[PDB]
Design a protein around this motif. Structure first.
Motif, PDB file in Angstrom:
ATOM      1  N   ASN B 173      36.991  47.071  48.986  1.00 39.25           N
ATOM      2  CA  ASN B 173      36.100  45.936  48.891  1.00 39.25           C
ATOM      3  C   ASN B 173      35.974  45.268  50.276  1.00 39.25           C
ATOM      4  O   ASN B 173      34.907  44.852  50.614  1.00 39.25           O
ATOM      5  CB  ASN B 173      36.548  44.953  47.847  1.00 39.25           C
ATOM      6  CG  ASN B 173      35.540  43.826  47.633  1.00 39.25           C
ATOM      7  OD1 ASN B 173      34.409  44.067  47.230  1.00 39.25           O
ATOM      8  ND2 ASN B 173      35.977  42.612  47.795  1.00 39.25           N
ATOM      9  N   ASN B 177      32.326  44.921  52.292  1.00 36.83           N
ATOM     10  CA  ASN B 177      31.928  43.668  52.795  1.00 36.83           C
ATOM     11  C   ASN B 177      31.848  43.579  54.316  1.00 36.83           C
ATOM     12  O   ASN B 177      30.920  42.888  54.823  1.00 36.83           O
ATOM     13  CB  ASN B 177      32.738  42.554  52.156  1.00 36.83           C
ATOM     14  CG  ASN B 177      32.267  42.379  50.682  1.00 36.83           C
ATOM     15  OD1 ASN B 177      31.191  42.863  50.199  1.00 36.83           O
ATOM     16  ND2 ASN B 177      33.095  41.663  49.948  1.00 36.83           N
ATOM     17  N   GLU B 180      28.525  45.066  55.051  1.00 41.71           N
ATOM     18  CA  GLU B 180      27.385  44.171  54.808  1.00 41.71           C
ATOM     19  C   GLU B 180      27.313  43.137  55.932  1.00 41.71           C
ATOM     20  O   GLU B 180      26.206  42.698  56.318  1.00 41.71           O
ATOM     21  CB  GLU B 180      27.449  43.489  53.448  1.00 41.71           C
ATOM     22  CG  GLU B 180      27.392  44.449  52.257  1.00 41.71           C
ATOM     23  CD  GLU B 180      26.053  45.184  52.232  1.00 41.71           C
ATOM     24  OE1 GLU B 180      25.097  44.571  52.798  1.00 41.71           O
ATOM     25  OE2 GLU B 180      25.983  46.321  51.742  1.00 41.71           O
ATOM     26  N   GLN B 184      23.869  42.587  58.182  1.00 39.07           N
ATOM     27  CA  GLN B 184      23.322  41.294  58.427  1.00 39.07           C
ATOM     28  C   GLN B 184      23.026  41.037  59.905  1.00 39.07           C
ATOM     29  O   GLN B 184      22.007  40.422  60.188  1.00 39.07           O
ATOM     30  CB  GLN B 184      24.206  40.166  57.924  1.00 39.07           C
ATOM     31  CG  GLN B 184      23.441  38.839  57.923  1.00 39.07           C
ATOM     32  CD  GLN B 184      24.213  37.730  57.281  1.00 39.07           C
ATOM     33  OE1 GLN B 184      25.377  37.900  56.834  1.00 39.07           O
ATOM     34  NE2 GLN B 184      23.581  36.576  57.192  1.00 39.07           N
TER      35      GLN B 184
ATOM     36  N   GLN C 325      22.788  39.980  52.022  1.00 46.13           N
ATOM     37  CA  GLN C 325      24.228  39.943  52.282  1.00 46.13           C
ATOM     38  C   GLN C 325      24.953  39.310  51.103  1.00 46.13           C
ATOM     39  O   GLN C 325      25.893  39.888  50.583  1.00 46.13           O
ATOM     40  CB  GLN C 325      24.592  39.196  53.559  1.00 46.13           C
ATOM     41  CG  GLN C 325      26.065  39.090  53.977  1.00 46.13           C
ATOM     42  CD  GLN C 325      26.951  38.209  53.092  1.00 46.13           C
ATOM     43  OE1 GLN C 325      26.545  37.137  52.636  1.00 46.13           O
ATOM     44  NE2 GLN C 325      28.116  38.722  52.736  1.00 46.13           N
ATOM     45  N   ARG C 328      24.494  41.687  47.911  1.00 44.64           N
ATOM     46  CA  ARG C 328      25.209  42.949  48.009  1.00 44.64           C
ATOM     47  C   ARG C 328      26.749  42.710  48.011  1.00 44.64           C
ATOM     48  O   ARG C 328      27.493  43.332  47.285  1.00 44.64           O
ATOM     49  CB  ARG C 328      24.736  43.769  49.186  1.00 44.64           C
ATOM     50  CG  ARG C 328      23.385  44.492  48.993  1.00 44.64           C
ATOM     51  CD  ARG C 328      23.016  45.162  50.292  1.00 44.64           C
ATOM     52  NE  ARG C 328      21.809  45.951  50.224  1.00 44.64           N
ATOM     53  CZ  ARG C 328      21.633  47.061  49.505  1.00 44.64           C
ATOM     54  NH1 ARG C 328      22.646  47.551  48.767  1.00 44.64           N
ATOM     55  NH2 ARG C 328      20.440  47.653  49.545  1.00 44.64           N
ATOM     56  N   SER C 329      27.183  41.655  48.667  1.00 45.04           N
ATOM     57  CA  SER C 329      28.583  41.327  48.694  1.00 45.04           C
ATOM     58  C   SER C 329      29.009  40.751  47.340  1.00 45.04           C
ATOM     59  O   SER C 329      30.088  41.131  46.825  1.00 45.04           O
ATOM     60  CB  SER C 329      28.935  40.452  49.884  1.00 45.04           C
ATOM     61  OG  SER C 329      28.592  39.113  49.576  1.00 45.04           O
ATOM     62  N   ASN C 332      29.307  43.943  45.031  1.00 42.62           N
ATOM     63  CA  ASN C 332      30.532  44.583  45.433  1.00 42.62           C
ATOM     64  C   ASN C 332      31.757  43.879  44.876  1.00 42.62           C
ATOM     65  O   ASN C 332      32.628  44.505  44.281  1.00 42.62           O
ATOM     66  CB  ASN C 332      30.608  44.674  46.975  1.00 42.62           C
ATOM     67  CG  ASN C 332      29.606  45.723  47.524  1.00 42.62           C
ATOM     68  OD1 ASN C 332      29.222  45.676  48.659  1.00 42.62           O
ATOM     69  ND2 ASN C 332      29.207  46.694  46.754  1.00 42.62           N
ATOM     70  N   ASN C 333      31.797  42.539  45.031  1.00 42.79           N
ATOM     71  CA  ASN C 333      32.911  41.751  44.581  1.00 42.79           C
ATOM     72  C   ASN C 333      33.081  41.775  43.076  1.00 42.79           C
ATOM     73  O   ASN C 333      34.207  41.716  42.625  1.00 42.79           O
ATOM     74  CB  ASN C 333      32.886  40.292  45.026  1.00 42.79           C
ATOM     75  CG  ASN C 333      32.991  40.096  46.524  1.00 42.79           C
ATOM     76  OD1 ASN C 333      33.352  41.003  47.271  1.00 42.79           O
ATOM     77  ND2 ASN C 333      32.621  38.877  46.986  1.00 42.79           N
TER      78      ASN C 333
END
Lengths: 428, 428, 428
Positions: B173, B177, B180, B184, C325, C328-329, C332-333
């Motif tokens: 994870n 992240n 990402e 960005q 961001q 997508r994060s 993912n989380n």
């Protein structure tokens, strides 16, 4: 070197506070500029003009020269009084922000000073742990060589020792970086500081939380400022309301003017109209002006200002929730600090007695060298936590004073008396 | 896929830098607007008026028509020159902020790139540690089945295995992240990056801190901008001072006007006065204006501007303290990084050799399976700490370059040459 | 006490939101002020003047009185329509910012509520771990007195108990401080909340990330606001372009004026010129004005505005990258949280079964009391991580809904249905 001396060196040179004092001075000085429209305005004008007639005035030319002293003086203008009072209230708000910044310097300086001493302790405990592991490694090597222990005990102790060598680099780096944070606030590099007296250290329970909350509500700087801003917003409604009122001004002057005409049609049936004139006039007049109706402009400004006043009222309720949060969490943190100090004093004793039991059990086979190295880590970790809880207790006492609105130089002086021996900020 | 390529893709599209380039452009363009009052102003006016006399002028009416070209030209006006110079200085400041922003993009891009590589390593080590525990679990399960170890060894290994399976989700994870975060800045998703060449990795001792400090004092962009702000505050005192000076303007025009009167009292004892006029005038004039006294307005504006200059001067000292903090803490971090790298390399060797000692110890009963699993954790933790210390060294090199004011594309190229083989940003 | 009720209490009194509502109301109200120049302007003036001739008009004095109603009305002025449309657009932007803030209060309120529940669970697991290690320390002290175990077991157990006593102080302080965070948002102190129903707890896989991204692009509030800001910047170019256009105004008035002259030269070869006049005038006139050339001022303003639009366009791209961001994060989380929940459920089963194996092994001498206390720490760490992961899953659901632009009160209600029994926020 002690905290009183560091803070005194910080106070004279700190550029964040010095900039804030400058903002305050400018704001006070601006009261003079805001008062200025209420005083006499006096200017000197003078000109020259050349004209050349044409199409039905062809043949009439001239050149005029004029010069005058003019004076204006406000007689009745609520809007000009209002601006002065608005600037006085702005200076008052800037003053409180200065007071807020003064208290921030004390808190930030004492905080950085204790951050240095806390990093000195971490590094000194890390080195004491390295030397205890080093002794275990040394005695284990000697025992291995004489056949009393397997080479496994040397190889486990060496791995542990290498880990504490790596931790020492980081403890050392954290101390160098805390020293630079202290140079940033204070301007200076300190090779030694006065350490906390831990033989004379004691803790004191804080005043009841209701009493701290009451004192904060009377003296917190943030909430005084929010109250001044709400009052400023209220004054701004009156300023909006002033757009409905009439004005009354006084004018005065003294000027002269020449004027010579010339060309085909100056005379011959002109009748004195184009001769030379050398006027001279002394005037004094009153001018009255009254709005009546401007498309809803005023009224809309009033209503906007009323909304602005409720926004400032919601900001005051925000500030109030913030000081409640800060004093109740500060009270809680001091009480947990005192309880952590007590819990980590006890953990150091029982970790030291567990370490000696691991050593006794290792010498009769019921424990291994790994148990002895692990107990050495638990002891040194407990020692670190006890030393950090005491700095956190002292910081939280500062935070509570700051949330009351009364942290000052005597509070620095009381903290300075809990200090005693010098300790190097760059040891080896 | 390598850092050079990632950066080139970031530099063309990054919106934060492109916004900064727009601010700069607008500020430069504004110099033309600030120069404009110093140039000829020329406008066309024209009107029609109807009047209807009454109360002692009843009977006299008229409707006029007028139209003119007017021109104004500043001859002497310090305040208009000062506004131009102020705007030039503001453009100068905006240009340095753009330079500051271009360097930020490099630092941010390189930092994000290495953060992905660092998250890749963490995840790869967490998987290697998973596999090493899995092998311990598999072999213990087999030996349990054949009567060589108790079931307690299988159970202890299963519990540790499950813990590392949970760690793997978090490592994954963190990798997703970090990816990402890179998207960005860059606009793109990279399925692979060029990894750090660890086979060829070396560290270099930094230049002495005094020399890095001298160079930062000459080139740091923050401190150049604080110097340019201090100068701008100095110019603003002059602008305040200009309110005392006189002005000299030039006016010029050409206009015509009709006017026809009418009504009871137009004629009969009027005397030509109310005939029809068709004026035509060509003018040129000079207008001089001089303040003398405005309630203390000027002077107060002067003093406020002086306080403001001292504020800007305190801001320069703040900027100085911050570059000193940044270079001295970056220098310490780089040196600590090189020491950590060395310490962790050694810690990996003693951890590996202690893990082999736990395995020999387990096979003869002086150690347990738990010691072998604990020694496997100690080993992987040290390997992680070494891989992280290298990224920290590289990041601190970036930071120190940025504090010098010279981080540039060649520096990015020097970092790019430390990379080699591709590694996946989304493995299984 | 449940989430639905906390949020209702927060929504009526939160000052941050209420301030935002006031800002929005001011902005809407300001539309009336912007429209105001487009409507009739009407004012009343009146004055008195005394003059005293000299130098070639010595002997002619006078005092005049005048008073009039004046009215202005815009006929053609693009700049005035433009300022209206700009204020309408600013109102539109402020409305979206209010919508954003309304969603933030739902997010912050639900986040703080789950932070209190999480801190309750940490403290309750810390106490359950304290009690398990107290039973080990008690049962070992009784076996020590009866001769079944050495004193080294009591000493290792007591050192460990003391470490969990210190942990409880800090778990209890984190719970008091989360309760104060919640009081800050909500205005109230809650002595009990409805707890997460873990018997009925389930996770659901999120929609595909491409679908969440599409929906965020259509509804995210930040990116709607960036779009409205880019539109506003477009309107500001037009406003700049308006500086080239001509204006057409209407004027009207009615005024009277007296004037009585006096002194040596009033009569005697004057010619009626210095008699008494009592003027009266009714006017209506149109005024046309056309710029032509202003030193490049307009044009430079246009160019600056065009750069400002590109700046706004770069900001829109920044806002898009930020929603990508965030979605997508968050996606993912959520997936990682679901994997974490599954991994920690399994790790608690293997940790409990490893603790039971440490106990059987201790009673037959293949494990020590130290293994039993270590396996107890492993077990409670895994139970804490599972409980944390569920709160993390729920908070990520909230964050994803907020990134879509649609977090609302029905989402809160769906969360509130995952709650059940009350638990105390201050237990002992």
């Amino acid at each position: 070197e002690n905290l009183m001396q560091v803070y005194q060196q910080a106070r004279l040179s700190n550029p964040e506070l010095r900039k804030s004092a400058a903002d305050r001075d400018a704001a006070f000085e601006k009261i003079n500029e805001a008062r200025s429209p209420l005083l006499p305005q006096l200017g000197l004008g003078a000109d020259y003009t050349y004209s050349n007639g044409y199409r039905d005035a062809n043949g009439i030319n001239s050149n005029a020269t004029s010069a005058s002293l003019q004076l204006t003086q406000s007689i009745f203008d609520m809007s000009k009084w209002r601006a002065l009072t608005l600037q006085e209230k702005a200076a008052g708000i800037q003053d409180v922000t200065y007071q807020t910044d003064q208290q921030t310097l004390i808190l930030n300086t004492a905080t950085a000073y204790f951050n240095v001493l806390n990093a000195i302790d971490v590094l000194s405990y890390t080195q004491a742990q390295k030397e205890a592991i080093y002794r275990q490694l040394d005695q284990t090597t000697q025992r291995f060589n004489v056949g009393l222990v397997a080479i496994t005990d040397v190889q486990n102790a060496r791995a542990q020792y290498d880990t504490v060598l790596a931790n020492e680099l980081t403890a050392r780096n954290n101390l160098d970086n805390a020293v630079e944070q202290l140079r940033q606030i204070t301007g200076n590099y300190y090779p030694e500081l006065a350490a906390l007296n831990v033989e004379n250290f004691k803790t004191d329970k804080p005043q009841p939380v209701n009493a701290l909350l009451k004192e904060a509500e009377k003296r917190n700087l943030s909430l005084l400022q929010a109250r001044l801003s709400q009052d400023l917003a209220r004054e701004q409604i009156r300023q909006a309301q002033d757009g409905h009122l009439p004005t009354l001004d006084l004018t005065a002057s003294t000027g002269i003017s020449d004027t010579s005409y010339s060309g085909s049609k100056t005379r011959g049936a002109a009748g004195t109209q184009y001769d030379d004139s050398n006027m001279g006039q002394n005037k004094v007049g009153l001018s009255f002006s009254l709005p009546i109706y401007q498309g809803g402009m005023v009224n809309s400004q009033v209503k906007q200002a009323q909304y602005n006043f409720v926004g400032a009222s919601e900001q005051l309720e925000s500030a109030h929730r913030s000081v409640v949060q800060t004093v109740r969490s500060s009270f809680n943190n001091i009480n947990a600090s005192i309880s952590s100090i007590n819990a980590y004093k006890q953990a150091v004793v029982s970790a030291q007695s567990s370490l000696d039991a691991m050593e006794a059990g290792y010498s009769v086979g019921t424990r291994t060298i790994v148990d002895v190295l692990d107990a050495t880590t638990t002891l040194y970790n407990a020692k670190q936590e006890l030393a950090n809880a005491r700095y956190n207790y002292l910081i939280n006492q500062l935070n509570i004073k700051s949330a009351l609105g009364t942290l000052n130089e005597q509070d620095l002086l009381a903290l300075n008396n809990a200090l005693s021996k010098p300790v190097s900020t760059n040891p080896e």
